[PDB]
Write a protein that binds this ligand. Structure first.
Ligand SMILES: COC(=O)c1ccncc1N
Ligand SMILES: COC(=O)c1ccncc1N
Ligand SMILES: [Zn+2]
Length: 139
């Protein structure tokens, strides 16, 4: 689990969104595994605006942060899980690293701020849903 809090937005994995997230829906993209809901409290996270390919992600199944190199956001074929059939996830970034389903929502960060959130994994790879392109998160 985990979310990003910026302005009056909460960014979560679409597959982990709650009933309140869907009741306060701002934007969702199934192909990206992202959902943004509205919040009453002001968020204070900074979204990275950059094309860094290095950063640090929180891994709840290790209680550790790991520095990684990751690919630029792209359309990557993702195997079926309990949440989606097999399909292309868009705006996905891969790194070599440990990931388990419950690690979804872990934040990937660079020097500029939040890059994205843990969304996918398998065979020693961790996939992160990019948020850096969502410029509207910042007004
Ligand atoms: C998104 O979680 C998964 O489906 C997953 C499966 C297997 N290994 C890592 C994972 N993250
Ligand atoms: C989980 O802690 C972090 O890595 C972090 C949180 C908030 N701002 C910057 C950070 N590096
Ligand atoms: Zn950056």
């Amino acid at each position: 689990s985990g979310a990003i809090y910026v302005g009056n937005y909460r960014v979560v994995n679409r597959h982990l969104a709650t009933h309140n997230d869907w009741a306060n829906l701002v934007w969702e993209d199934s192909s990206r595994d992202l959902l943004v809901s509205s919040t009453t409290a002001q968020g204070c996270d900074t979204i990275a605006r950059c094309d860094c390919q290095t950063g640090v992600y929180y891994c709840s199944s290790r209680r550790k942060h790991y520095p990684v190199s990751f690919s630029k956001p792209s359309l990557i074929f993702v195997e079926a899980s309990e949440y989606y059939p097999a399909r292309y996830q868009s705006h996905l970034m891969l790194a070599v690293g440990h990931s388990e389903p419950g690690d979804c929502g872990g934040i990937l960060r660079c020097q500029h701020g939040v890059v994205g959130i843990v969304s996918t994994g398998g065979n020693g790879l961790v996939g992160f849903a990019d948020v850096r392109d969502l410029l509207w998160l910042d007004e």
